[PDB]
Amino acid sequence: EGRMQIDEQPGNAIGAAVEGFDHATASDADIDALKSTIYTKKIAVLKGQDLSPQQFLALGKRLGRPEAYYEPMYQHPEVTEIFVSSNVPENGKQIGVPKTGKFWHADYQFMPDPFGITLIYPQVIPEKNRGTYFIDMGRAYDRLPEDLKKEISGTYCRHSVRKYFKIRPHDVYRPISEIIEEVERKTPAVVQPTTFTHPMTGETVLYISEGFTVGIEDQDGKPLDEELLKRLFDATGQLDESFEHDNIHLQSFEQGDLLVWDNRSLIHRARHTTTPEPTVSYRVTVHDERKLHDGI
Protein backbone atom coordinates (compact mmCIF):
# COMPACT_ATOMS: atom_id res chain seq x y z
CA GLU A 1 0.00 0.00 0.00
CA GLY A 2 0.80 3.70 0.11
CA ARG A 3 -0.69 4.68 -3.26
CA MET A 4 -4.25 3.31 -3.80
CA GLN A 5 -6.69 6.23 -3.55
CA ILE A 6 -10.46 5.77 -3.68
CA ASP A 7 -12.62 8.71 -4.82
CA GLU A 8 -16.26 7.94 -3.99
CA GLN A 9 -19.06 9.81 -5.72
CA PRO A 10 -20.68 12.25 -3.27
CA GLY A 11 -23.58 11.20 -1.09
CA ASN A 12 -26.02 8.83 -2.78
CA ALA A 13 -24.60 9.09 -6.30
CA ILE A 14 -23.58 5.63 -7.47
CA GLY A 15 -19.97 4.80 -8.16
CA ALA A 16 -16.33 5.41 -7.27
CA ALA A 17 -13.00 5.86 -9.06
CA VAL A 18 -9.86 4.11 -7.79
CA GLU A 19 -6.45 5.45 -8.80
CA GLY A 20 -3.08 3.82 -8.22
CA PHE A 21 -4.40 0.29 -7.62
CA ASP A 22 -1.88 -2.52 -8.15
CA HIS A 23 -3.31 -5.95 -7.39
CA ALA A 24 0.21 -7.36 -6.98
CA THR A 25 1.22 -5.00 -4.16
CA ALA A 26 -2.02 -3.73 -2.54
CA SER A 27 -2.15 -4.28 1.22
CA ASP A 28 -4.83 -6.30 2.99
CA ALA A 29 -6.25 -2.99 4.25
CA ASP A 30 -6.39 -1.74 0.63
CA ILE A 31 -8.44 -4.74 -0.51
CA ASP A 32 -10.78 -4.37 2.48
CA ALA A 33 -11.33 -0.69 1.66
CA LEU A 34 -11.93 -1.49 -2.01
CA LYS A 35 -14.47 -4.15 -1.01
CA SER A 36 -16.28 -1.71 1.27
CA THR A 37 -16.47 0.73 -1.65
CA ILE A 38 -17.90 -1.94 -3.95
CA TYR A 39 -20.62 -2.81 -1.44
CA THR A 40 -21.57 0.81 -0.70
CA LYS A 41 -20.94 2.70 -3.96
CA LYS A 42 -21.93 -0.42 -5.97
CA ILE A 43 -19.54 0.23 -8.90
CA ALA A 44 -15.80 0.83 -8.51
CA VAL A 45 -13.86 1.79 -11.64
CA LEU A 46 -10.18 0.86 -11.33
CA LYS A 47 -8.11 3.22 -13.47
CA GLY A 48 -4.91 2.64 -15.41
CA GLN A 49 -5.15 -1.17 -15.53
CA ASP A 50 -2.91 -2.76 -18.18
CA LEU A 51 -3.22 -6.49 -17.53
CA SER A 52 -2.67 -9.76 -19.34
CA PRO A 53 -5.52 -12.29 -19.07
CA GLN A 54 -3.47 -13.98 -16.35
CA GLN A 55 -2.93 -10.72 -14.45
CA PHE A 56 -6.66 -9.95 -14.68
CA LEU A 57 -7.45 -13.29 -13.05
CA ALA A 58 -4.85 -12.56 -10.34
CA LEU A 59 -6.59 -9.23 -9.66
CA GLY A 60 -9.90 -11.03 -9.26
CA LYS A 61 -8.29 -13.53 -6.88
CA ARG A 62 -7.43 -10.60 -4.57
CA LEU A 63 -11.16 -9.96 -4.16
CA GLY A 64 -12.61 -13.47 -3.96
CA ARG A 65 -12.81 -16.99 -5.34
CA PRO A 66 -13.27 -17.01 -9.14
CA GLU A 67 -15.86 -19.28 -10.71
CA ALA A 68 -15.74 -20.28 -14.37
CA TYR A 69 -18.88 -19.99 -16.49
CA TYR A 70 -20.83 -23.25 -16.63
CA GLU A 71 -21.02 -23.16 -20.46
CA PRO A 72 -17.42 -23.46 -21.72
CA MET A 73 -17.88 -21.85 -25.14
CA TYR A 74 -17.72 -18.53 -23.22
CA GLN A 75 -14.33 -19.31 -21.66
CA HIS A 76 -11.10 -17.60 -22.65
CA PRO A 77 -8.81 -20.07 -24.48
CA GLU A 78 -5.96 -19.64 -21.98
CA VAL A 79 -7.84 -18.79 -18.75
CA THR A 80 -10.90 -20.97 -18.08
CA GLU A 81 -12.13 -18.56 -15.40
CA ILE A 82 -12.39 -15.62 -17.86
CA PHE A 83 -15.78 -15.23 -19.57
CA VAL A 84 -15.34 -13.56 -22.97
CA SER A 85 -18.03 -11.45 -24.59
CA SER A 86 -16.71 -10.69 -28.07
CA ASN A 87 -17.80 -10.01 -31.61
CA VAL A 88 -14.29 -9.28 -32.94
CA PRO A 89 -12.76 -12.38 -34.60
CA GLU A 90 -9.20 -13.21 -33.55
CA ASN A 91 -7.27 -14.46 -36.58
CA GLY A 92 -10.68 -15.02 -38.16
CA LYS A 93 -11.79 -17.18 -35.20
CA GLN A 94 -14.67 -16.63 -32.77
CA ILE A 95 -13.40 -16.15 -29.19
CA GLY A 96 -16.04 -16.32 -26.51
CA VAL A 97 -19.60 -15.47 -27.53
CA PRO A 98 -20.89 -12.35 -29.37
CA LYS A 99 -23.53 -9.90 -28.18
CA THR A 100 -24.05 -11.24 -24.67
CA GLY A 101 -26.21 -9.73 -21.93
CA LYS A 102 -28.70 -7.83 -24.12
CA PHE A 103 -31.33 -7.98 -21.36
CA TRP A 104 -31.69 -6.88 -17.74
CA HIS A 105 -30.09 -9.39 -15.38
CA ALA A 106 -27.88 -10.14 -12.42
CA ASP A 107 -25.07 -12.55 -13.22
CA TYR A 108 -25.77 -16.21 -12.31
CA GLN A 109 -29.24 -15.20 -11.08
CA PHE A 110 -30.48 -18.45 -12.67
CA MET A 111 -27.98 -20.51 -10.63
CA PRO A 112 -28.52 -21.74 -7.05
CA ASP A 113 -25.32 -20.16 -5.61
CA PRO A 114 -24.63 -16.82 -7.32
CA PHE A 115 -21.36 -14.96 -6.70
CA GLY A 116 -21.29 -11.56 -5.07
CA ILE A 117 -18.83 -9.55 -7.22
CA THR A 118 -18.48 -9.12 -10.99
CA LEU A 119 -15.33 -7.76 -12.67
CA ILE A 120 -15.34 -6.49 -16.28
CA TYR A 121 -12.11 -5.62 -18.12
CA PRO A 122 -13.13 -3.99 -21.43
CA GLN A 123 -10.78 -4.82 -24.28
CA VAL A 124 -12.56 -3.15 -27.25
CA ILE A 125 -14.81 -0.20 -26.38
CA PRO A 126 -17.33 1.31 -28.85
CA GLU A 127 -16.45 4.92 -29.54
CA LYS A 128 -20.02 6.24 -29.55
CA ASN A 129 -22.36 3.55 -28.17
CA ARG A 130 -20.23 2.50 -25.19
CA GLY A 131 -21.22 1.66 -21.65
CA THR A 132 -23.39 -0.67 -19.63
CA TYR A 133 -26.71 0.24 -18.02
CA PHE A 134 -27.29 -0.47 -14.33
CA ILE A 135 -30.13 -0.41 -11.82
CA ASP A 136 -29.52 -0.55 -8.04
CA MET A 137 -32.30 -2.90 -7.01
CA GLY A 138 -31.97 -1.97 -3.34
CA ARG A 139 -32.57 1.70 -4.10
CA ALA A 140 -35.24 0.54 -6.55
CA TYR A 141 -36.91 -1.47 -3.79
CA ASP A 142 -36.93 1.53 -1.45
CA ARG A 143 -38.59 3.70 -4.11
CA LEU A 144 -41.48 1.27 -4.76
CA PRO A 145 -44.88 2.36 -3.41
CA GLU A 146 -45.52 1.02 0.08
CA ASP A 147 -48.40 -1.15 -1.14
CA LEU A 148 -46.23 -2.77 -3.81
CA LYS A 149 -43.64 -3.48 -1.12
CA LYS A 150 -46.47 -5.10 0.85
CA GLU A 151 -47.67 -7.14 -2.12
CA ILE A 152 -44.27 -8.78 -2.62
CA SER A 153 -43.64 -9.33 1.10
CA GLY A 154 -43.33 -13.06 1.70
CA THR A 155 -43.28 -14.01 -2.01
CA TYR A 156 -40.69 -16.07 -3.88
CA CYS A 157 -39.39 -15.73 -7.45
CA ARG A 158 -38.30 -18.35 -9.97
CA HIS A 159 -35.24 -17.58 -12.12
CA SER A 160 -34.22 -19.41 -15.27
CA VAL A 161 -31.78 -19.05 -18.16
CA ARG A 162 -34.28 -20.65 -20.53
CA LYS A 163 -35.02 -17.50 -22.56
CA TYR A 164 -31.45 -16.42 -23.26
CA PHE A 165 -29.49 -19.67 -23.40
CA LYS A 166 -27.35 -19.31 -26.53
CA ILE A 167 -27.13 -22.05 -29.18
CA ARG A 168 -23.71 -23.71 -29.23
CA PRO A 169 -21.80 -25.09 -32.23
CA HIS A 170 -22.49 -28.67 -31.13
CA ASP A 171 -26.26 -28.01 -31.02
CA VAL A 172 -26.49 -27.86 -34.84
CA TYR A 173 -28.98 -30.41 -36.31
CA ARG A 174 -30.46 -31.21 -32.86
CA PRO A 175 -34.24 -30.96 -32.43
CA ILE A 176 -34.99 -27.83 -30.45
CA SER A 177 -37.18 -29.63 -27.88
CA GLU A 178 -34.18 -31.74 -26.85
CA ILE A 179 -32.12 -28.60 -26.18
CA ILE A 180 -35.06 -27.05 -24.30
CA GLU A 181 -35.22 -30.16 -22.08
CA GLU A 182 -31.46 -30.29 -21.59
CA VAL A 183 -31.48 -26.68 -20.33
CA GLU A 184 -34.20 -27.55 -17.80
CA ARG A 185 -32.14 -30.54 -16.59
CA LYS A 186 -28.77 -28.80 -16.41
CA THR A 187 -29.97 -25.43 -15.05
CA PRO A 188 -33.44 -25.95 -13.56
CA ALA A 189 -35.30 -22.84 -12.47
CA VAL A 190 -34.10 -21.63 -9.06
CA VAL A 191 -36.47 -20.35 -6.37
CA GLN A 192 -35.28 -17.41 -4.29
CA PRO A 193 -37.01 -15.04 -1.89
CA THR A 194 -38.27 -12.09 -3.91
CA THR A 195 -36.36 -9.79 -1.56
CA PHE A 196 -33.36 -10.62 0.58
CA THR A 197 -31.13 -8.81 3.05
CA HIS A 198 -27.73 -7.80 1.66
CA PRO A 199 -25.15 -9.53 3.93
CA MET A 200 -22.65 -6.67 3.62
CA THR A 201 -24.92 -3.61 3.93
CA GLY A 202 -28.18 -4.83 5.48
CA GLU A 203 -30.17 -3.33 2.56
CA THR A 204 -33.33 -4.99 1.32
CA VAL A 205 -32.69 -6.02 -2.30
CA LEU A 206 -35.45 -6.71 -4.82
CA TYR A 207 -33.82 -9.66 -6.59
CA ILE A 208 -35.61 -9.82 -9.94
CA SER A 209 -34.66 -9.14 -13.53
CA GLU A 210 -36.62 -9.01 -16.76
CA GLY A 211 -34.18 -11.38 -18.44
CA PHE A 212 -34.02 -14.19 -15.88
CA THR A 213 -37.03 -13.92 -13.53
CA VAL A 214 -39.74 -16.11 -15.06
CA GLY A 215 -42.32 -16.37 -12.28
CA ILE A 216 -43.42 -15.26 -8.84
CA GLU A 217 -45.23 -17.38 -6.26
CA ASP A 218 -46.83 -16.86 -2.87
CA GLN A 219 -45.59 -17.76 0.62
CA ASP A 220 -47.30 -21.15 0.12
CA GLY A 221 -45.55 -21.92 -3.19
CA LYS A 222 -48.54 -21.41 -5.50
CA PRO A 223 -47.77 -19.47 -8.71
CA LEU A 224 -48.99 -15.88 -8.84
CA ASP A 225 -50.18 -14.14 -11.99
CA GLU A 226 -47.23 -12.81 -13.96
CA GLU A 227 -48.82 -9.35 -14.13
CA LEU A 228 -47.24 -8.75 -10.72
CA LEU A 229 -43.76 -9.29 -12.18
CA LYS A 230 -44.63 -6.98 -15.07
CA ARG A 231 -45.69 -4.27 -12.62
CA LEU A 232 -42.43 -4.74 -10.69
CA PHE A 233 -40.35 -4.53 -13.89
CA ASP A 234 -42.32 -1.42 -14.86
CA ALA A 235 -41.88 0.31 -11.50
CA THR A 236 -38.14 -0.39 -11.27
CA GLY A 237 -37.44 0.91 -14.78
CA GLN A 238 -36.74 -2.39 -16.56
CA LEU A 239 -39.43 -1.88 -19.25
CA ASP A 240 -38.29 1.61 -20.31
CA GLU A 241 -36.75 1.11 -23.75
CA SER A 242 -35.68 4.77 -23.74
CA PHE A 243 -33.43 4.10 -20.70
CA GLU A 244 -34.39 7.54 -19.38
CA HIS A 245 -35.97 6.10 -16.22
CA ASP A 246 -34.79 7.69 -12.97
CA ASN A 247 -33.46 4.36 -11.62
CA ILE A 248 -31.20 3.76 -14.63
CA HIS A 249 -27.47 4.53 -14.55
CA LEU A 250 -25.33 4.54 -17.70
CA GLN A 251 -21.79 3.49 -16.76
CA SER A 252 -19.21 4.54 -19.33
CA PHE A 253 -15.55 3.56 -19.40
CA GLU A 254 -12.27 4.43 -21.13
CA GLN A 255 -9.24 2.38 -22.10
CA GLY A 256 -7.51 1.06 -18.99
CA ASP A 257 -10.70 1.09 -16.91
CA LEU A 258 -11.73 -2.05 -15.03
CA LEU A 259 -15.27 -2.24 -13.59
CA VAL A 260 -15.94 -4.10 -10.34
CA TRP A 261 -19.49 -4.16 -9.05
CA ASP A 262 -21.96 -5.49 -6.50
CA ASN A 263 -23.70 -8.45 -8.15
CA ARG A 264 -26.15 -8.74 -5.24
CA SER A 265 -27.57 -5.22 -5.51
CA LEU A 266 -27.27 -4.40 -9.21
CA ILE A 267 -28.85 -5.59 -12.41
CA HIS A 268 -27.31 -4.58 -15.71
CA ARG A 269 -27.76 -4.83 -19.48
CA ALA A 270 -26.01 -3.98 -22.73
CA ARG A 271 -27.09 -0.95 -24.73
CA HIS A 272 -29.25 -1.17 -27.82
CA THR A 273 -27.24 -1.96 -30.95
CA THR A 274 -27.85 1.55 -32.28
CA THR A 275 -24.43 1.54 -34.00
CA PRO A 276 -22.42 -1.35 -35.50
CA GLU A 277 -19.50 -0.76 -33.12
CA PRO A 278 -18.05 -3.97 -31.64
CA THR A 279 -17.70 -5.02 -28.00
CA VAL A 280 -15.02 -7.22 -26.44
CA SER A 281 -14.89 -7.60 -22.67
CA TYR A 282 -13.26 -10.05 -20.27
CA ARG A 283 -15.21 -11.04 -17.15
CA VAL A 284 -14.11 -12.59 -13.84
CA THR A 285 -16.81 -13.46 -11.29
CA VAL A 286 -15.79 -14.09 -7.69
CA HIS A 287 -17.39 -15.40 -4.51
CA ASP A 288 -16.64 -13.22 -1.50
CA GLU A 289 -16.84 -14.00 2.20
CA ARG A 290 -20.64 -14.46 2.26
CA LYS A 291 -23.26 -16.29 0.23
CA LEU A 292 -25.52 -14.18 -1.98
CA HIS A 293 -27.95 -14.11 0.95
CA ASP A 294 -28.19 -16.04 4.21
CA GLY A 295 -30.75 -18.51 2.84
CA ILE A 296 -28.50 -19.96 0.12
Ligand X SMILES: O=C(O)CCC(=O)C(=O)O
| For ligand X, the closer CB: 65 or 99 | 99
The SS3 call for residue 177 is helix
Where does this chain touch Fe ion (CB under 5 A) — which range of 89-97, 102-110, 169-177, 220-228? 102-110
Partner from ligand X, Cl ion, Fe ion, none binding residue 100, C-beta < 5-8 Å depending on class: ligand X
Q: Is 210 in the site for Fe ion (CB under 5 A)?
A: no
Which class for 148: exposed (0-12), middle (13-18), buried (19 or more C-beta within 10 A)? middle
The C-alpha angle 283, 288, 292, rounded to 5 degrees, equals: 95
Task: Please tell me whether 23 is known to bind a ligand.
Answer: no
Task: Please tell me whether 74 is known to bind a ligand.
Answer: yes
Task: Please tell me whether 287 is known to bind a ligand.
Answer: no
Residue of 64, 101, 138, 237 that binds ligand X (CB under 6 A): 101
CB of 106 to Fe ion, least distance (A): 8
CA distance 287 to 248: 26
CA distance 213 to 190: 9
| For ligand X, the closer CB: 143 or 168 | 168
CA distance 192 to 212: 12
Q: Is 257 in the site for Fe ion (CB under 5 A)?
A: no
Helices 28-41 and 53-63, axial angle in degrees (round to 10): 80
Task: Please tell me whether 107 is known to bind a ligand.
Answer: yes
Query: What are the φ/ψ torsions at residue 61 (nearest 5 degrees)?
Result: -65, -20
Q: Is 100 in the site for ligand X (CB under 6 A)?
A: yes
| For ligand X, the closer CB: 3 or 99 | 99
Partner from Fe ion, ligand X, Cl ion, none binding residue 164, C-beta < 5-8 Å depending on class: ligand X
Residue of 101, 199, 211, 237 that binds Fe ion (CB under 5 A): 101
Please state the residue numbers annotated as binding site.
Answer: 69, 74, 101, 105, 107-108, 166, 268, 272, 283
What is the binding site for ligand X (CB under 6 A)?
Answer: 85, 100-101, 107, 164, 268, 270
